[PDB]
Amino acid sequence: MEAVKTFNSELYSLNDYKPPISKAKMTQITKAAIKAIKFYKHVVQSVEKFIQKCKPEYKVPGLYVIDSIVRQSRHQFGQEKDVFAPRFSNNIISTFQNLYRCPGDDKSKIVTVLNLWQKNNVFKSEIIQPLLDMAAALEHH
């Protein structure tokens, strides 16, 4: 799993840093994911696995990994050619259920990303709206 293993290493290395995660570290993780593009399904799986299992403090950094990977891929391969956003979209409800287990004050950070994704057409609005609704529902509960 050479390319995937090197990606898993970069992803897991988040556990060795206290958030906020640096630009430099996010770039390293992102470059590893792009290099492993042949195995993009496995990369998406590893990110989702990480988000599912990580400590609450790493939920938002896990989302920043998705954002960073998706935006780099769109830049590098073309917006319509990017394989990562459509693949991340498949289990995105599950993913955000897990992300919303973050500390209370980190919920706003998730919404900021969602609003940027909508604004910049990173993901389809149809996909984004239930994710935003989920934020709001937890705010009332």
Binding site: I21, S22, K23, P61, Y64, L116
Partner: peptide, 8 residues
């Protein structure tokens, strides 16, 4: 310098 979703 920490990662931000707003920056290129």
């Amino acid at each position: 310098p920490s990662y931000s979703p707003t920056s290129p």
